[model samples]
Target: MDDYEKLLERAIDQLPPEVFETKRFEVPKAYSVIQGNRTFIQNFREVADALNRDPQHLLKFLLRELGTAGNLEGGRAILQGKFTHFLINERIEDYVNKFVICHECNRPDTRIIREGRISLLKCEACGAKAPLKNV
Candidate 1:
C-alpha cells in the first residue's frame, strides 16, 4: 500500500516558516579598472547615486582617506595611483557609515543640514540629529 499521505505530512509540517521581507539598503562595490599608474572607478557616479549622495562629496572624502589626489571624469573617478576594488569599497563603506547611515535607526534616510558653522546629520526615519565634521 502507499504511505504517501503520512510521508508528505511530516515534511509539510517541518517546512521552513515563510519570511516576508523587502529590499535592504546595500552599497554597490567599486567597479575599478587599472591602466598604467592610474586607477579608475567605472561606476563612481552610480555608487553615489545609489546612496543619494553628491559625487563630488564622495570623491573628496575618498581621495582624502586614500591620501591621494583624483578627479571625476565622465562617470568614473580617476585616482592618482593604482588601487584595488577592495580598498575602494572599504573606503566607501566607511563613508556610508559616517555620512549616509543614521546612527539611531541605522537607515540611510538622512540629510545634511548646516546650522551656523556646525553641520548636522538629520535622519528622516527616526528624527535623530547628529553633528558631523567637514571633509
Candidate 2:
C-alpha cells in the first residue's frame, strides 16, 4: 500500500522462481536462519546493487526485521527478540511482521523498543532480547 510495500512487492514479484521459492531452512535446536543459496544471494545482491543498496541491509532491515522469510521456516523464530532499526530508515508493520521472530519461542511476538544506530528486538513471549545479525 505504501512506497516500500510497493517496492517490496515489485522486487518479490520480479524475483526468479528459484530465488523466490528457495525455502529457508533451520538448524534444528540451533535455530540458525539460512535462506537463499549463493546464487540466490547473488541475484538478490544484483537487484539491490542495481538500486544502489546493500542486499544484506535490505534483508536484515526490511526482509529479516519484518519477518518476510518466505518459504524460509523458523526465520521468524531466529530473528525473534532481536533489534532491527539499523536495518531500515522507516517503520512499516508489513516489514516488521516479516523480519522479527522469537528465537526461543519461535513466535512472531516481538517489537522494536529502541531506535538508534543499533535497533533492538524484544520478544513479547519470553522477554528475550538481542541484536539482529547483519549477515
Candidate 3:
C-alpha cells in the first residue's frame, strides 16, 4: 500500500479501543490528538515525501482548499489556534465560496488581514475594498 494509506491505517490502529465499538466504527472524538502540530507536520511530511512534493506546497494546498487564508501567518499560529475540524462538508464549501475571493475589487489577491477582528481584502491595483457577499 502507499505511504498515505499506511499512515492512515497506523493512525486508525493507534486510536483508543474505547473510541471505536467495532473496527468499522469510530467515535466522534477518537483521533483528536492528530490535530497537534507535531502529528500534523509528521503526517504531512510523510505524505508529501510519498507524493514527491514539497511539504509547504501540500500545506498551502490544504489551507487554500479549506479556505483558511485568513489564518495563514506562521506555523505557530496554525499550531496554537483551533483548526476548522468541526466544520461540516457544507460549511467548508460555504467558507470556500464566501472567503476565497478577493475582498477588494474581487481579485484573487485575497490574502488575510493578519491583525484585526474584521479581515479586509484590498485590491492590489485599484485599492477598492472587497465586500463580503451574501452576508
The lDDT leader among the candidates is 1
Candidates' C-alpha lDDT: 0.48, 0.33, 0.33
Q: Please write out the lDDT profile of model 3 over residues 23-92, one tens digit for every residue.
A: 2211111111235331223232333332222446434544554533334333533322333333222222
- Which lDDT tens digits does candidate 2 get at residues 1-135? 322232333224455565443222111111122333211222233333322233455455434444443332332323322222222212222123323433334444554453333234545455455445544
Report each candidate's C-alpha RMSD, comma-separated, in the order given.
15.0, 15.2, 16.9
| Candidate 2: regions farther than 4 A off | 2-37, 42-112, 115-118, 124-127, 131-135
Candidate 1 regions with alpha-carbon error over 4 angstroms: 1-29, 34-36, 50-52, 65-69, 72-75, 82-87, 91-135
- List residue ranges in candidate 3 displaced over 4 A: 1-42, 69-135
> In model 3, which range of ten residues has the least summed lDDT?
24-33
Clashes of each: 0, 16, 2
What's the lDDT for residue 117 in model 1?
Answer: 30
Worst window of 10 by summed lDDT in candidate 1:
1-10
Clashing pairs in 3: 103-130, 104-130
TM-score between model 3 and native:
0.21
As a whole number from 0 to 100, the lDDT of residue 58 in candidate 2 is: 46
